[PDB]
């Protein structure tokens, strides 16, 4: 406005004393001083004309002369470039880790750049390889490269035993020109709802992947899920294809095409899909499709041999992946 560059100033002063300090009475005084300047119908040109108004005071007018010369203030940006605030935004920047370890990490006086080795008395990691491939995780992944990651893995799988089936999901199957990672799903006809549990089916696929040296590291094992790091092979070009990021997941044969729909679709889409079923009278899950009716009591599960057997059941014209936004 007229003096309405010095009212933007005086507001922020009042927030920090409300919060991270909590000096009331000095929350109050800052605040009244804002209004008096807002009402005065004349452009101020010196903190020397300010003491005359019954609102502004002693050390307050003083802070205005520094404002009206430079156009910047000591008692301000110092609170702005030092706070835990606008550093929560920084501290994680250079970490690739977890919520409450920061604080104690930071609390050691350890920070972003030239503040990083200065104090390394935590000797943790992530899990022992976060802080190392920190550099390649923050770049996107071109489509063209996704296609030949895909092609290698299906090749190994089938050569072991042609009864396996496997497919890749996420943004890649929707049709992106760039991705953030890889997510794959895996089944076999000797694992079902009513059977013994079999991790050895997933161990084998992993071990042979290491053998041809496509998989390089391990972050997590289990009976159902693996979590690691991979790389494409070179003939002798530049320094590197960057190291990348892959997940793998084992599922019952009879609940397969119910999970694949689920690891694609789209959030918004998957939400609009489960309401139309309510209308026609069905209930749909990450595991099954069941007959409902009358009240809260679903029936048996109905049989499914394909993605499309699902659409039929609820009376919808089919919709290809490219269109599931
Ligand atoms: Cl961690
Ligand atoms: Cl994917
Ligand atoms: Na993080
Ligand atoms: Na995308």
Swiss-Prot record:
Na(+) 1 binds at residues 51, 53, 56. Repair polymerase that plays a key role in base-excision repair. During this process, the damaged base is excised by specific DNA glycosylases, the DNA backbone is nicked at the abasic site by an apurinic/apyrimidic (AP) endonuclease, and POLB removes 5'-deoxyribose-phosphate from the preincised AP site acting as a 5'-deoxyribose-phosphate lyase (5'-dRP lyase); through its DNA polymerase activity, it adds one nucleotide to the 3' end of the arising single-nucleotide gap. Changing residue 182 to T: 50% loss of activity. Pfam families: DNA_pol_B_palm (PF14792), DNA_pol_B_thumb (PF14791), DNA_pol_lambd_f (PF10391), HHH_8 (PF14716). It catalyses: DNA(n) + a 2'-deoxyribonucleoside 5'-triphosphate = DNA(n+1) + diphosphate; a 5'-end 2'-deoxyribose-2'-deoxyribonucleotide-DNA = (2E,4S)-4-hydroxypenten-2-al-5-phosphate + a 5'-end 5'-phospho-2'-deoxyribonucleoside-DNA + H(+); 2'-deoxyribonucleotide-(2'-deoxyribose 5'-phosphate)-2'-deoxyribonucleotide-DNA = a 3'-end 2'-deoxyribonucleotide-(2,3-dehydro-2,3-deoxyribose 5'-phosphate)-DNA + a 5'-end 5'-phospho-2'-deoxyribonucleoside-DNA + H(+). K(+) 1 binds at residues 51, 53, 56. It is found in: Nucleus; Cytoplasm. The keyword Acetylation applies. This is DNA polymerase beta. Residues 239-252 form a flexible loop which appears to affect the polymerase fidelity. Methylation by PRMT6 stimulates the polymerase activity by enhancing DNA binding and processivity. Ubiquitinated at Lys-32, Lys-52 and Lys-72: monoubiquitinated by HUWE1/ARF-BP1. Monoubiquitinated protein is then the target of STUB1/CHIP, which catalyzes polyubiquitination from monoubiquitin, leading to degradation by the proteasome. USP47 mediates the deubiquitination of monoubiquitinated protein, preventing polyubiquitination by STUB1/CHIP and its subsequent degradation. The modification Omega-N-methylarginine is found at residues 74, 143. Mg(2+) 1 binds at residues 181, 183. The gene is Polb. Changing residue 237 to V: Misincorporates T nucleotide opposite G/C template. CDD domains: NT_POLXc. InterPro entries: DNA-dir_DNA_pol_X, DNA_pol-X_BS, DNA_pol_b-like_N, DNA_pol_B_palm_palm, DNA_pol_lambd_fingers_domain, DNA_pol_lamdba_lyase_dom_sf, DNA_Pol_thumb_sf, DNA_pol_X. It comes from Rattus norvegicus. Keywords: Acetylation, Cytoplasm, DNA damage, DNA repair, DNA replication, DNA synthesis, DNA-binding, DNA-directed DNA polymerase, Isopeptide bond, Lyase, Magnesium, Metal-binding, Methylation, Nucleotidyltransferase, Nucleus, Potassium, Sodium, Transferase, Ubl conjugation. Monomer. Binds single-stranded DNA (ssDNA). Interacts with APEX1, LIG1, LIG3, FEN1, PCNA and XRCC1. Interacts with HUWE1/ARF-BP1, STUB1/CHIP and USP47. Interacts with FAM168A.
């Amino acid at each position: 406005t007229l003096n309405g560059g010095i009212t933007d100033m005086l507001v922020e002063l009042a927030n920090f004393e409300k919060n991270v300090s909590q000096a009331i009475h000095k929350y109050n005084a800052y605040r009244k001083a804002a209004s008096v300047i807002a009402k005065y119908p004349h452009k101020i040109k010196s903190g020397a004309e300010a003491k005359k108004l019954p609102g502004v005071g002693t050390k307050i007018a003083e802070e205005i002369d520094e404002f009206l010369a430079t156009g910047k203030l000591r008692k301000l940006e110092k609170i702005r470039q030092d706070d835990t605030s606008s550093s929560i935004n920084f501290l994680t920047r250079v970490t690739g880790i977890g919520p409450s370890a920061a604080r104690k990490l930071v609390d050691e006086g350890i920070k972003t750049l030239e503040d990083l080795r200065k104090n390394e008395d935590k000797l943790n990691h992530h899990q022992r390889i976060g802080l190392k491939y920190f550099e390649d995780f923050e770049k996107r992944i071109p489509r063209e490269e996704m296609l030949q990651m895909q092609d290698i893995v299906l090749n190994e799988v089938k050569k072991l035993d042609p009864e396996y089936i496997a497919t890749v999901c996420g943004s890649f199957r929707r049709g992106a020109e760039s991705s953030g990672d890889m997510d794959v799903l895996l089944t076999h006809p000797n694992f079902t709802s009513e059977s013994s549990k079999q991790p050895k089916l997933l161990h084998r696929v992993v071990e042979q992947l290491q053998k041809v040296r496509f998989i390089t590291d391990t972050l997590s094992k289990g009976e159902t899920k693996f979590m690691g790091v991979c790389q494409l092979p070179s003939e002798n070009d530049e320094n590197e294809y960057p190291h990348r990021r892959i997940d793998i997941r084992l599922i019952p044969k009879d609940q397969y095409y119910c999970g694949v729909l689920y690891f694609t679709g789209s959030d918004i889409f998957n939400k609009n899909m489960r309401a139309h079923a309510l209308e026609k009278g069905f209930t749909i899950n990450e595991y099954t499709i069941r007959p409902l009716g009358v009240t809260g009591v679903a029936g048996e599960p109905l049989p499914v041999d394909s993605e499309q057997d699902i659409f039929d059941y609820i009376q919808w014209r089919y919709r290809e992946p490219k269109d599931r936004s």
